[PDB]
Amino acid sequence: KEEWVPCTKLGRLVKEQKITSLEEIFLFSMPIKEHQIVDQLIKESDMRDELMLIVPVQKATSAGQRTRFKAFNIVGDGNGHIGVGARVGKEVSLAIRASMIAAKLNVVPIRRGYWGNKIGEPHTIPMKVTGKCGSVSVRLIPAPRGAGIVAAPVPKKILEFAGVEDVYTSSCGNTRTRGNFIMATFYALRKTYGFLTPDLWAETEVSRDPTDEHSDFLTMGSK
């Protein structure tokens, strides 16, 4: 792109070789405020960007009416990183460009476990999870190997992104409003790490934030 100037601590570190992966940023909870943080760390040839929806919205005005376009982006790596944008712009290309920014901010990692057969690398979600936006709520159920992605084409996409290849699913409520279904499905795949399991606990040690360690070089950064 055009030449870039970080206004973020993280941004500086990422432009240097200090933070070299998403993991570091995630592990000590910090918000991503610049999409350029994603592009630098995760190289292109792993990232994919699809537009799940583009639709007109209308706002009422006396006589003629102004119009706009909502759209969704979806983004991520098949290595277990996903992130869903949605944004609004008064023209087509506007809302498109805007979506992809927001999407790369909202990126979250994915835990994949097993069904109770352990071979290779994860093919299955570690547990049942649910996510809800509007009246729709999705129930992701873990499936045995070779099941394939058993869901509708709308979530099939969203699951392919997140590296889940074996699942069984069902939805509830009004599912024929597209937008609500997307957000729902995504909140599901978050909830994995949000749930405490015996395998994880051992009172795993914490250490200093990248920010703190690199404080000196951020001071120098400011200059």
Binding site: P31, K33, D216
Partner: protein
């Protein structure tokens, strides 16, 4: 702490100051979450804060600002005149950043703004009306330390120092004690002497 020689413990003259300038008291109203801090109630109806409790809170917050090796990342904030003065004198010594007068929204979250900053830590004079600050500390992963009136809520306050924020002489004492002890642990002013400059410098005066 330990191992240690009873270091950074309350003393004769320390107590003598606090009682005198009336920061040992709280606000009159009963707490909404700070019930534990209160020690009894007077026959004036004003809730006294326990001294030992307050003291340990202060030492704690010293350990926090001691653990920032680039003090400018810590912020101080007042929205009250009585703390205004004491901020400026503190930001000289300890070297902290500050905003005083009034908090401005989006100094910790809005990218397009030249008053933008990303703190490591945040302080406040009153969590009640500095509240905008706290709610933008929440979403940036910034811990908080506040000077809590007994009445005051503790929402989005991680660590809390019970305090009286009514009148000049109350608030000045607290900043003075922090600043003192902080500089005793960094740049090693000894606790052998009484500290170099006075609490009268931290009193609001009007110009």
């Amino acid at each position: 702490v330990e191992s240690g020689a009873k270091v950074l413990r309350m003393k004769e003259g320390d107590v003598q100051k606090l009682v005198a300038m009336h920061c040992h008291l709280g606000t009159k109203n009963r707490s909404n979450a700070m019930k534990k801090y209160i020690h009894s109630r007077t026959k004036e109806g004003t809730n006294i804060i326990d001294l030992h409790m307050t003291w340990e809170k202060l030492i704690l917050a010293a350990r926090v600002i001691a653990a920032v090796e680039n003090p400018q990342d810590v912020t101080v904030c007042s929205t009250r005149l009585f703390g205004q003065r004491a901020i400026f004198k503190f930001s000289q010594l300890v070297g902290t950043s500050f905003l005083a007068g009034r908090f401005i929204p989006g100094t910790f979250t809005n990218q397009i703004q030249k008053k933008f900053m990303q703190p490591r830590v945040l302080l406040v004079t009153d969590p009640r009306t500095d509240h905008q600050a706290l709610r933008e500390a929440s979403l940036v992963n910034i811990p908080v330390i506040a000077f809590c009136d007994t009445d005051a809520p503790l929402e989005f306050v991680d660590i809390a120092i019970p305090c009286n924020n009514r009148g000049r002489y109350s608030i000045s004492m607290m900043y003075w004690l922090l600043a003192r002890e902080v500089l005793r642990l960094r740049g090693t002013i000894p606790r052998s002497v009484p500290w170099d400059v006075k609490v009268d410098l931290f009193f609001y005066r009007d110009p």
